[PDB]
Ligand binder design. Structure first.
Ligand SMILES: Cc1cc2nc3c(=O)[nH]c(=O)nc-3n(C[C@H](O)[C@H](O)[C@H](O)COP(=O)(O)O)c2cc1C
Length: 138
């Protein structure tokens, strides 16, 4: 499996690492890839796209890297299974509600409830691991 994410301070990166840990604990392998290093062709071959990005600007996906990435894969993911996650601060998940609607609009099948964690995981570390385990069970 593959996890692709964007993180500005490391919070979403930490989530990605924990999600990977859950998948691995379930007995499977998974590679964690920063969005700037992603290879689209290899990504689109995946059974499940695990995508993460923190809340940016005013409740939107990060604009310089993650957003263009989503726009690029948008027309070649209809029917693809996807799982979404990200860290946020002061809001209550609007950016993620929009991210989910967006992916559904591209024809994707959102396999689990998107995982959103406030700031660094900390107490929510296990929640991140469990999300990975659910994805590994699909
Ligand atoms: C420029 C900027 C804008 C942000 N906009 C939002 C927002 O609209 N809603 C929210 O809840 N958090 C917002 N945040 C807070 C981040 O989502 C939060 O700090 C998160 O933990 C960062 O994760 P990261 O290290 O993976 O980037 C913003 C942070 C920055 C730097």
């Amino acid at each position: 499996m593959k996890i692709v994410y964007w993180s500005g301070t490391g919070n979403t990166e930490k989530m990605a690492e924990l999600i990977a840990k859950g998948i691995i604990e379930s007995g499977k392998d998974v590679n964690t890839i920063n969005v700037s290093d992603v290879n689209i062709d290899e990504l689109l071959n995946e059974d499940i796209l695990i995508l993460g990005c923190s809340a940016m600007t005013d409740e939107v996906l990060e604009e310089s890297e993650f957003e263009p990435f989503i726009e690029e894969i948008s027309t070649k993911i209809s029917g693809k299974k996807v799982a979404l996650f990200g860290s946020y601060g002061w809001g209550d998940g609007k950016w993620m509600r929009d991210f989910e609607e967006r992916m559904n609009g591209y024809g994707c099948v959102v396999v689990e409830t998107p995982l959103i964690v406030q700031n660094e995981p900390d107490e929510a570390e296990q929640d991140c691991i469990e999300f990975g385990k659910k994805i590994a069970n699909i």
